[PDB]
Amino acid sequence: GDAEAGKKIFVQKCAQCHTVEKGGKHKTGPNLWGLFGRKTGQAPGFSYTDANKNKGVIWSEETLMEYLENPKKYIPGTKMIFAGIKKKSEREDLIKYLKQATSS
Ligand code: HEM
Secondary structure, eight states, X not given: OOHHHHHHHHHHHTTTTOXXXXXXXXXXXXXXXXXXXXXXXXXXXXOOOHHXXXXXXXXXXXXXXXXXXXXXXXXXXXXXXXXXXXXXXXXXXXXXXXXXXXXX
């Protein structure tokens, strides 16, 4: 994974609805700090759909790779309205960036 490439992908496709830094604001979507190793739908203070709260998996590289390829397929009923990122390489780079930005 290439975090530098990932950072650019984040700005292009995710930043309009998400922040990732510690203490960052919730916007259309939840601030994502602390995401890795945590069960779905647990960002503090964000109002999730029951679907996002109930998916039940632990976010990590593997689960984010599947989710980001097609969000509504992975979480039917989600209010995250976004097509997904088809390219495996792009998802890997994006996730690399997310791991770095949301864990420090
Ligand atoms: C960009 C490609 C992108 C990423 C990365 C991303 C991630 C993401 C995660 C990991 C969650 C779940 C967090 C958790 O379970 O705690 C999540 C949730 C929502 N998102 Fe998102 N998201 C990306 C892009 C976008 C875009 C462009 C929007 C807005 C149009 C958006 C919105 C949302 C919303 C809303 C949620 C909450 C969904 C719910 O059902 O509660 N995301 N995202």
